[PDB]
Design a binder for this molecule. Structure first.
Ligand SMILES: CC(C)CNC(=O)[C@H](Nc1ccc2c(c1)CNC2)c1cc(Cl)cc2[nH]ncc12
Lengths: 39, 156
């Protein structure tokens, strides 16, 4: 049996860790909600 | 019980100790999370009980207490923030510029950040603090890195 616990407010924090790239990927979404790479 | 707006951890005691299976957004009296996290099962908030209202396995989304309330969209240009809530660790904002998931049914934003499975359902925010989607459903590319989609439901 599952339960929820609060973890914080939903706010944008100025001066936060800026990391991660922006790739353009060809993908396919199946009937089960699963993504897959198309090449 | 706790119907306060904000980000929440989805936990279970079925496994060893207390394990975090995912994250979610409470807004306008409705709890929004990824379908694979809860599987449409009921949730507990104190002695309060949250029952599923809407869900879709293809979209990988589910809303509790009412219909889907999140509607803000990524503009395709601006940088966004992943409000990541990792298992056993404090909520942390990570700013990134999203990428693109080209599909036959249109393009969707993508966030190339790496977090454990229990972080699934963490919101993605715009510069105003409006939730533009949920992080936690995506793909794994050549270098083993994880790319999640920016999953947004449809508001009625
Ligand atoms: C990595 C790909 C292959 C899996 N995709 C994920 O997004 C994954 N969750 C997941 C699990 C089952 C289902 C779906 C999604 C959609 N409907 C079935 C996940 C998300 C995060 Cl944040 C981390 C993860 N680590 N391993 C897995 C994992």
């Amino acid at each position: 049996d599952m339960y929820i616990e609060r973890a914080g407010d939903i706010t944008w924090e100025k001066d936060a860790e800026v990391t991660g790239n922006s790739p353009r990927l060809d993908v396919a979404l199946d009937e089960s909600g699963d993504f897959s790479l198309v090449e | 019980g706790e119907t306060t707006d904000g980000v929440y951890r989805v936990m279970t005691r079925r496994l060893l100790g207390s394990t975090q299976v995912g994250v979610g957004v409470m807004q306008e009296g409705v709890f929004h999370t990824m379908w694979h996290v809860t599987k449409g099962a009921a949730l507990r908030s104190g002695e309060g009980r949250l029952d599923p209202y809407w869900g879709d396995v293809k979209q990988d989304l589910v809303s509790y207490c009412g219909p889907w309330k999140l509607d803000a969209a990524w503009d395709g240009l601006s940088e966004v923030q992943l409000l990541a809530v990792p298992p056993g660790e404090r909520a942390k904002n990570i700013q990134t510029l999203p990428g693109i998931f080209k599909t036959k049914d249109g393009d969707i934003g993508a966030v190339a950040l790496d977090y454990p499975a229990g972080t699934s359902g963490s919101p993605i925010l715009d510069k105003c603090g409006r939730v533009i989607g949920l992080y936690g459903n995506g793909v794994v590319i050549k270098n083993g890195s994880y790319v999640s989609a920016i999953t947004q439901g449809k508001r009625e």
